[PDB]
RNA sequence: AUCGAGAGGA
């Protein structure tokens, strides 16, 4: 639902790159160039950022249980 | 969906059915596994008469 | 001569080992031997 | 059933295969007696089938326990 | 349900020996070292160091089961030598090699950070 | 001495049927002193052999220069004088067949000894006079050296 | 039936071996005397197999014939193959 | 749940007693996927093992007498062959002739019948794989294979 | 089909008189498989006297006790002398060949198609090979086995 | 019959990775060093969580697992701290553990990113790597107005054999014989394969000529750090840990030999 | 060869004679056997009841 | 708990 912390394969930290990745994408980067800007050179970490579906943004459309 | 922890099951002298005093059916009922007709035929071919009697008499409903 | 005598003994022992054992459920065994291959041969 | 339950195999062996009720009812009407020779009959009664390890008896050897 | 704790690969159980030496009776001057709570990391280096000893006739190791957490190292030496002595010397040589490698890596790091 | 056969061979062909294995090559060779054909499987990866080469082949029952049997067990810590010191390529195998041109009544004029060096096969065929040292299910060594 | 002429096989069948070993192992487990010597064996099955190899199991196999008669064979009288 | 049933199963239904089936007088279990592809690759003619590799493999032989066999190649460098190690795996002194699946049909007629160019024509003698590439035909569930002859 | 077959044959068993009988004690086979042998131990073999011609059969199975030099190549000196001199032995070998020829005709009526593949208990060629390797038989030297010893 | 005399040559040293070469050592030593980089170099990581309040959309174990994988600077502290197995204290103490606290509440209308910057420690030396004084902070959870996350974690000493969260590496590139001279690989078509970065071959040549007398030497390493340790600290700690494994093994060996 | 006519030559070899055979779509084994030039010894059927 | 039904696994 949320960006993983580490790459499943190598263990590189990708948790701090989702927001930067999105900011680069709205900056008219291609996904490949964006992944290059964040330093994801192994295709495992590129897999992590490139195949992520941010479902938490949809789960935050529901009001919480307590106000 | 098929995780092993939802499938693993074992029995050793658990509950029994009311009508025929044989082990229950299912993991949820803590039931026993069915030693069916084909298992009976296999053990007849093996010639294992005491094991066959243990499974079909002594481990089910003495 | 030594090899032939050993061969004769070996033939005798293996033949006596090949004899069917009383108590073999050859009928159930034959039913299984004929039904197991039936599960592979084609329906059509 | 038309070939296997038409031989003199005993009502209990036949009821195990097919036509359980018809076979047992015929045996009742005719007073048939099952001699308990097959494996099905002994299996139903929880007795040692005369099959493999059950086709013989064991006796203790009093003269050899010494 | 059946998951062993992850520390069981590294930690010795109470009353369990780290290493056990058993004489191999098939051939003379051979021993089996059953080392508990180790794996290929030490087995491979100990074996390969033992292979550098010309007085070692056999040096092998195996992890008998991956789910279990022991290794067995079989060492056969020449009659004038001993498998226990060979194993000891192999460990000593590995320790000296690693000490030298560590000191040289420290020197290389110092050179790289300085210039 | 422990030598069953010795001669100089000349590689007349390599893999007539084509390369079957990458690191192994079959040499069809013929000697000059005895007129014996040789089919030999050699690990060309470690001991490459070119067409037209000339080598000395020595089938031996033992490696020790003095008559002394071998145990068939690997003893690298052996300081005895071994005749493998005088050769480049050495294999160790066993004779698994001895054919001949014998009839029901006549003995063999030509023999054909087959040896397997752990799967690398050799056939040394020629006059039966030169192959009396070969007996089936007997361990031998190759002892082969290249010469110019 | 004339014990001087027993028509059944002189070999112990696999089923006879199985049942004799099981029976004797149960007897040993129920504190019956052992007929062979024992180094350190405590499993009744191992003791029963040792007794069978030694030919010292005090059991008689009563083999029934289809006609209804029977033949009594001592476990030491039969040929143990396996 | 009893010593009698335990003895029954141990003497009648144990898997080693179940290797050959009476249905078709052949093995019912044989060597299977990875072990079969790998034994085919292993018994090829150009498989040469080094001393450390050989010792690694001998660690996994339960029925090993502890004697390293004399390598098939002594010089320029000691090398064992895959057939030389499978010979250690092969039990007893069994004798077996088979043919690898790629055995050409016109090879048993011409020359080279007993020295196969393709390393087909499996020959095991005295429990040593004298020659040939092992495969389904030699280690599978067919009749007359090494596993059958071993049993 | 499997269940039907099982229920039809389930109680057929090999009895201690070696007959195969059902629960009724009726006789289904006087010996199991017509040969009283279990199916695990039998294996494929070849009948060597089925397919060959009369000339080939004669040449391969008729012991030739007239060729002195061939016997000298196959047998040792005392065996050669006994085989060539004795006529009792020669008659024994002649009747051996006649018995094999009768067996040949029996096989020819049993297998009307020339299929020598048979399933029999003991793999005699493999046992012969085992004996050759166990005793280190040299195929090139004359043997010390008397053919009369083979017949007897 | 004696040890190797390995040499070292570091070809790149940054804060993110160390690229070096070890020569004149055995392949087993090189691979055991490589394995220890991954599995026996201790670091500090969160291994105990107590959720006092979690109104977020991720359940408690999700947050706990996520906190465990945040790297914590472990450089000089990991050698000083003890394993809780070895500590003579209760469940916790400052000698075997580091306390973290996290307390965030989304009151404002925009989504609140609970990141690793919100993990407040009692020890200034052991902090989240991203929080160390660029790269953004690791995201623990996004919160909506009215959602709240309050927890208390404890970080422990461990290595990658127990859990990958104690693995300090973000990839260990290991290579040897870049030109296939030992022929430990057999390319069916050697021309089809790209050249290693460490290759020394002209472009027409696909692989080096086969070396029959060759042995694996000159192993190339690129140890990338997840952040907890410096890459050179990972390598030094790996060598020290492997040496202490061997020393303990030798101690137990001596007790077994003398007891016989 | 399973349907060819396997004979034994005068020399003693098995020889497979290549001969015409008929396969019918129905069965009258009772009648077909009793026909001129039809082999009443090898002519058979797959209908076991007949 | 029973029974039935349905959905699935090999
Ligand atoms: Zn990655
Ligand atoms: Zn503490």
JSON list of N, CA, C and O in Angstrom, two decimals, chain A residues 7-40:
[
{"chain": "A", "resi": 7, "resn": "UNK", "atom": "N", "xyz": [14.73, -2.18, -0.83]},
{"chain": "A", "resi": 7, "resn": "UNK", "atom": "CA", "xyz": [14.55, -3.03, -1.99]},
{"chain": "A", "resi": 7, "resn": "UNK", "atom": "C", "xyz": [14.53, -4.49, -1.54]},
{"chain": "A", "resi": 7, "resn": "UNK", "atom": "O", "xyz": [15.39, -4.92, -0.77]},
{"chain": "A", "resi": 8, "resn": "UNK", "atom": "N", "xyz": [13.54, -5.25, -2.01]},
{"chain": "A", "resi": 8, "resn": "UNK", "atom": "CA", "xyz": [13.41, -6.63, -1.59]},
{"chain": "A", "resi": 8, "resn": "UNK", "atom": "C", "xyz": [14.65, -7.44, -1.93]},
{"chain": "A", "resi": 8, "resn": "UNK", "atom": "O", "xyz": [15.00, -8.38, -1.21]},
{"chain": "A", "resi": 9, "resn": "UNK", "atom": "N", "xyz": [15.34, -7.10, -3.01]},
{"chain": "A", "resi": 9, "resn": "UNK", "atom": "CA", "xyz": [16.44, -7.91, -3.50]},
{"chain": "A", "resi": 9, "resn": "UNK", "atom": "C", "xyz": [17.74, -7.58, -2.79]},
{"chain": "A", "resi": 9, "resn": "UNK", "atom": "O", "xyz": [18.35, -8.44, -2.15]},
{"chain": "A", "resi": 10, "resn": "UNK", "atom": "N", "xyz": [18.19, -6.33, -2.90]},
{"chain": "A", "resi": 10, "resn": "UNK", "atom": "CA", "xyz": [19.49, -5.94, -2.37]},
{"chain": "A", "resi": 10, "resn": "UNK", "atom": "C", "xyz": [19.40, -5.39, -0.95]},
{"chain": "A", "resi": 10, "resn": "UNK", "atom": "O", "xyz": [20.35, -5.55, -0.18]},
{"chain": "A", "resi": 11, "resn": "UNK", "atom": "N", "xyz": [18.30, -4.75, -0.60]},
{"chain": "A", "resi": 11, "resn": "UNK", "atom": "CA", "xyz": [18.17, -4.08, 0.67]},
{"chain": "A", "resi": 11, "resn": "UNK", "atom": "C", "xyz": [18.51, -2.61, 0.63]},
{"chain": "A", "resi": 11, "resn": "UNK", "atom": "O", "xyz": [18.67, -2.00, 1.69]},
{"chain": "A", "resi": 12, "resn": "UNK", "atom": "N", "xyz": [18.65, -2.02, -0.55]},
{"chain": "A", "resi": 12, "resn": "UNK", "atom": "CA", "xyz": [18.82, -0.59, -0.67]},
{"chain": "A", "resi": 12, "resn": "UNK", "atom": "C", "xyz": [17.55, 0.12, -0.22]},
{"chain": "A", "resi": 12, "resn": "UNK", "atom": "O", "xyz": [16.44, -0.34, -0.48]},
{"chain": "A", "resi": 13, "resn": "UNK", "atom": "N", "xyz": [17.72, 1.26, 0.43]},
{"chain": "A", "resi": 13, "resn": "UNK", "atom": "CA", "xyz": [16.59, 2.03, 0.92]},
{"chain": "A", "resi": 13, "resn": "UNK", "atom": "C", "xyz": [15.93, 2.73, -0.26]},
{"chain": "A", "resi": 13, "resn": "UNK", "atom": "O", "xyz": [16.57, 3.51, -0.97]},
{"chain": "A", "resi": 14, "resn": "UNK", "atom": "N", "xyz": [14.64, 2.45, -0.46]},
{"chain": "A", "resi": 14, "resn": "UNK", "atom": "CA", "xyz": [13.83, 3.13, -1.45]},
{"chain": "A", "resi": 14, "resn": "UNK", "atom": "C", "xyz": [12.69, 3.92, -0.82]},
{"chain": "A", "resi": 14, "resn": "UNK", "atom": "O", "xyz": [11.97, 4.62, -1.55]},
{"chain": "A", "resi": 15, "resn": "UNK", "atom": "N", "xyz": [12.51, 3.83, 0.50]},
{"chain": "A", "resi": 15, "resn": "UNK", "atom": "CA", "xyz": [11.39, 4.50, 1.14]},
{"chain": "A", "resi": 15, "resn": "UNK", "atom": "C", "xyz": [11.44, 6.01, 1.02]},
{"chain": "A", "resi": 15, "resn": "UNK", "atom": "O", "xyz": [10.40, 6.66, 0.99]},
{"chain": "A", "resi": 16, "resn": "UNK", "atom": "N", "xyz": [12.64, 6.58, 0.96]},
{"chain": "A", "resi": 16, "resn": "UNK", "atom": "CA", "xyz": [12.79, 8.03, 0.88]},
{"chain": "A", "resi": 16, "resn": "UNK", "atom": "C", "xyz": [12.81, 8.55, -0.54]},
{"chain": "A", "resi": 16, "resn": "UNK", "atom": "O", "xyz": [13.12, 9.73, -0.75]},
{"chain": "A", "resi": 17, "resn": "UNK", "atom": "N", "xyz": [12.48, 7.72, -1.53]},
{"chain": "A", "resi": 17, "resn": "UNK", "atom": "CA", "xyz": [12.59, 8.09, -2.93]},
{"chain": "A", "resi": 17, "resn": "UNK", "atom": "C", "xyz": [11.25, 8.19, -3.65]},
{"chain": "A", "resi": 17, "resn": "UNK", "atom": "O", "xyz": [11.22, 8.68, -4.78]},
{"chain": "A", "resi": 18, "resn": "UNK", "atom": "N", "xyz": [10.16, 7.74, -3.03]},
{"chain": "A", "resi": 18, "resn": "UNK", "atom": "CA", "xyz": [8.87, 7.78, -3.71]},
{"chain": "A", "resi": 18, "resn": "UNK", "atom": "C", "xyz": [8.43, 9.22, -3.97]},
{"chain": "A", "resi": 18, "resn": "UNK", "atom": "O", "xyz": [8.01, 9.56, -5.09]},
{"chain": "A", "resi": 19, "resn": "UNK", "atom": "N", "xyz": [8.51, 10.07, -2.95]},
{"chain": "A", "resi": 19, "resn": "UNK", "atom": "CA", "xyz": [8.07, 11.45, -3.12]},
{"chain": "A", "resi": 19, "resn": "UNK", "atom": "C", "xyz": [8.97, 12.19, -4.10]},
{"chain": "A", "resi": 19, "resn": "UNK", "atom": "O", "xyz": [8.48, 12.94, -4.95]},
{"chain": "A", "resi": 20, "resn": "UNK", "atom": "N", "xyz": [10.28, 11.98, -4.00]},
{"chain": "A", "resi": 20, "resn": "UNK", "atom": "CA", "xyz": [11.20, 12.57, -4.95]},
{"chain": "A", "resi": 20, "resn": "UNK", "atom": "C", "xyz": [10.95, 12.04, -6.36]},
{"chain": "A", "resi": 20, "resn": "UNK", "atom": "O", "xyz": [11.06, 12.78, -7.34]},
{"chain": "A", "resi": 21, "resn": "UNK", "atom": "N", "xyz": [10.63, 10.75, -6.47]},
{"chain": "A", "resi": 21, "resn": "UNK", "atom": "CA", "xyz": [10.33, 10.17, -7.77]},
{"chain": "A", "resi": 21, "resn": "UNK", "atom": "C", "xyz": [9.11, 10.84, -8.39]},
{"chain": "A", "resi": 21, "resn": "UNK", "atom": "O", "xyz": [9.13, 11.21, -9.57]},
{"chain": "A", "resi": 22, "resn": "UNK", "atom": "N", "xyz": [8.05, 11.02, -7.61]},
{"chain": "A", "resi": 22, "resn": "UNK", "atom": "CA", "xyz": [6.86, 11.68, -8.13]},
{"chain": "A", "resi": 22, "resn": "UNK", "atom": "C", "xyz": [7.15, 13.13, -8.50]},
{"chain": "A", "resi": 22, "resn": "UNK", "atom": "O", "xyz": [6.66, 13.62, -9.53]},
{"chain": "A", "resi": 23, "resn": "UNK", "atom": "N", "xyz": [7.92, 13.83, -7.67]},
{"chain": "A", "resi": 23, "resn": "UNK", "atom": "CA", "xyz": [8.29, 15.19, -8.00]},
{"chain": "A", "resi": 23, "resn": "UNK", "atom": "C", "xyz": [9.10, 15.30, -9.27]},
{"chain": "A", "resi": 23, "resn": "UNK", "atom": "O", "xyz": [8.97, 16.27, -10.02]},
{"chain": "A", "resi": 24, "resn": "UNK", "atom": "N", "xyz": [9.96, 14.31, -9.53]},
{"chain": "A", "resi": 24, "resn": "UNK", "atom": "CA", "xyz": [10.70, 14.30, -10.79]},
{"chain": "A", "resi": 24, "resn": "UNK", "atom": "C", "xyz": [9.78, 13.99, -11.96]},
{"chain": "A", "resi": 24, "resn": "UNK", "atom": "O", "xyz": [9.95, 14.55, -13.05]},
{"chain": "A", "resi": 25, "resn": "UNK", "atom": "N", "xyz": [8.80, 13.11, -11.76]},
{"chain": "A", "resi": 25, "resn": "UNK", "atom": "CA", "xyz": [7.88, 12.78, -12.84]},
{"chain": "A", "resi": 25, "resn": "UNK", "atom": "C", "xyz": [7.02, 13.98, -13.22]},
{"chain": "A", "resi": 25, "resn": "UNK", "atom": "O", "xyz": [6.78, 14.22, -14.41]},
{"chain": "A", "resi": 26, "resn": "UNK", "atom": "N", "xyz": [6.53, 14.75, -12.24]},
{"chain": "A", "resi": 26, "resn": "UNK", "atom": "CA", "xyz": [5.80, 15.96, -12.60]},
{"chain": "A", "resi": 26, "resn": "UNK", "atom": "C", "xyz": [6.74, 17.04, -13.15]},
{"chain": "A", "resi": 26, "resn": "UNK", "atom": "O", "xyz": [6.26, 18.00, -13.77]},
{"chain": "A", "resi": 27, "resn": "UNK", "atom": "N", "xyz": [8.05, 16.91, -12.95]},
{"chain": "A", "resi": 27, "resn": "UNK", "atom": "CA", "xyz": [9.02, 17.79, -13.56]},
{"chain": "A", "resi": 27, "resn": "UNK", "atom": "C", "xyz": [9.36, 17.39, -14.99]},
{"chain": "A", "resi": 27, "resn": "UNK", "atom": "O", "xyz": [10.37, 17.87, -15.53]},
{"chain": "A", "resi": 28, "resn": "UNK", "atom": "N", "xyz": [8.55, 16.53, -15.61]},
{"chain": "A", "resi": 28, "resn": "UNK", "atom": "CA", "xyz": [8.69, 16.13, -17.01]},
{"chain": "A", "resi": 28, "resn": "UNK", "atom": "C", "xyz": [9.97, 15.33, -17.23]},
{"chain": "A", "resi": 28, "resn": "UNK", "atom": "O", "xyz": [10.60, 15.42, -18.28]},
{"chain": "A", "resi": 29, "resn": "UNK", "atom": "N", "xyz": [10.35, 14.54, -16.23]},
{"chain": "A", "resi": 29, "resn": "UNK", "atom": "CA", "xyz": [11.33, 13.49, -16.43]},
{"chain": "A", "resi": 29, "resn": "UNK", "atom": "C", "xyz": [10.63, 12.25, -16.97]},
{"chain": "A", "resi": 29, "resn": "UNK", "atom": "O", "xyz": [9.47, 11.98, -16.66]},
{"chain": "A", "resi": 30, "resn": "UNK", "atom": "N", "xyz": [11.35, 11.48, -17.78]},
{"chain": "A", "resi": 30, "resn": "UNK", "atom": "CA", "xyz": [10.90, 10.13, -18.06]},
{"chain": "A", "resi": 30, "resn": "UNK", "atom": "C", "xyz": [11.17, 9.27, -16.84]},
{"chain": "A", "resi": 30, "resn": "UNK", "atom": "O", "xyz": [12.03, 9.58, -16.01]},
{"chain": "A", "resi": 31, "resn": "UNK", "atom": "N", "xyz": [10.42, 8.17, -16.72]},
{"chain": "A", "resi": 31, "resn": "UNK", "atom": "CA", "xyz": [10.58, 7.29, -15.58]},
{"chain": "A", "resi": 31, "resn": "UNK", "atom": "C", "xyz": [12.01, 6.78, -15.48]},
{"chain": "A", "resi": 31, "resn": "UNK", "atom": "O", "xyz": [12.57, 6.67, -14.38]},
{"chain": "A", "resi": 32, "resn": "UNK", "atom": "N", "xyz": [12.64, 6.47, -16.61]},
{"chain": "A", "resi": 32, "resn": "UNK", "atom": "CA", "xyz": [14.02, 6.02, -16.59]},
{"chain": "A", "resi": 32, "resn": "UNK", "atom": "C", "xyz": [14.97, 7.10, -16.10]},
{"chain": "A", "resi": 32, "resn": "UNK", "atom": "O", "xyz": [15.84, 6.84, -15.26]},
{"chain": "A", "resi": 33, "resn": "UNK", "atom": "N", "xyz": [14.83, 8.31, -16.62]},
{"chain": "A", "resi": 33, "resn": "UNK", "atom": "CA", "xyz": [15.68, 9.41, -16.18]},
{"chain": "A", "resi": 33, "resn": "UNK", "atom": "C", "xyz": [15.43, 9.75, -14.72]},
{"chain": "A", "resi": 33, "resn": "UNK", "atom": "O", "xyz": [16.36, 10.10, -13.98]},
{"chain": "A", "resi": 34, "resn": "UNK", "atom": "N", "xyz": [14.17, 9.68, -14.28]},
{"chain": "A", "resi": 34, "resn": "UNK", "atom": "CA", "xyz": [13.87, 9.91, -12.87]},
{"chain": "A", "resi": 34, "resn": "UNK", "atom": "C", "xyz": [14.56, 8.87, -12.00]},
{"chain": "A", "resi": 34, "resn": "UNK", "atom": "O", "xyz": [15.18, 9.21, -10.98]},
{"chain": "A", "resi": 35, "resn": "UNK", "atom": "N", "xyz": [14.48, 7.60, -12.38]},
{"chain": "A", "resi": 35, "resn": "UNK", "atom": "CA", "xyz": [15.14, 6.55, -11.62]},
{"chain": "A", "resi": 35, "resn": "UNK", "atom": "C", "xyz": [16.66, 6.73, -11.64]},
{"chain": "A", "resi": 35, "resn": "UNK", "atom": "O", "xyz": [17.33, 6.35, -10.68]},
{"chain": "A", "resi": 36, "resn": "UNK", "atom": "N", "xyz": [17.20, 7.28, -12.72]},
{"chain": "A", "resi": 36, "resn": "UNK", "atom": "CA", "xyz": [18.63, 7.56, -12.76]},
{"chain": "A", "resi": 36, "resn": "UNK", "atom": "C", "xyz": [19.00, 8.72, -11.84]},
{"chain": "A", "resi": 36, "resn": "UNK", "atom": "O", "xyz": [20.08, 8.72, -11.23]},
{"chain": "A", "resi": 37, "resn": "UNK", "atom": "N", "xyz": [18.12, 9.71, -11.73]},
{"chain": "A", "resi": 37, "resn": "UNK", "atom": "CA", "xyz": [18.39, 10.85, -10.86]},
{"chain": "A", "resi": 37, "resn": "UNK", "atom": "C", "xyz": [18.42, 10.45, -9.39]},
{"chain": "A", "resi": 37, "resn": "UNK", "atom": "O", "xyz": [19.17, 11.04, -8.60]},
{"chain": "A", "resi": 38, "resn": "UNK", "atom": "N", "xyz": [17.61, 9.47, -9.00]},
{"chain": "A", "resi": 38, "resn": "UNK", "atom": "CA", "xyz": [17.57, 9.01, -7.62]},
{"chain": "A", "resi": 38, "resn": "UNK", "atom": "C", "xyz": [18.66, 8.00, -7.30]},
{"chain": "A", "resi": 38, "resn": "UNK", "atom": "O", "xyz": [18.78, 7.60, -6.14]},
{"chain": "A", "resi": 39, "resn": "UNK", "atom": "N", "xyz": [19.44, 7.57, -8.28]},
{"chain": "A", "resi": 39, "resn": "UNK", "atom": "CA", "xyz": [20.53, 6.66, -8.01]},
{"chain": "A", "resi": 39, "resn": "UNK", "atom": "C", "xyz": [20.15, 5.21, -7.96]},
{"chain": "A", "resi": 39, "resn": "UNK", "atom": "O", "xyz": [20.87, 4.41, -7.36]},
{"chain": "A", "resi": 40, "resn": "UNK", "atom": "N", "xyz": [19.02, 4.83, -8.56]},
{"chain": "A", "resi": 40, "resn": "UNK", "atom": "CA", "xyz": [18.60, 3.44, -8.63]},
{"chain": "A", "resi": 40, "resn": "UNK", "atom": "C", "xyz": [19.16, 2.86, -9.92]},
{"chain": "A", "resi": 40, "resn": "UNK", "atom": "O", "xyz": [18.56, 3.00, -10.99]}
]
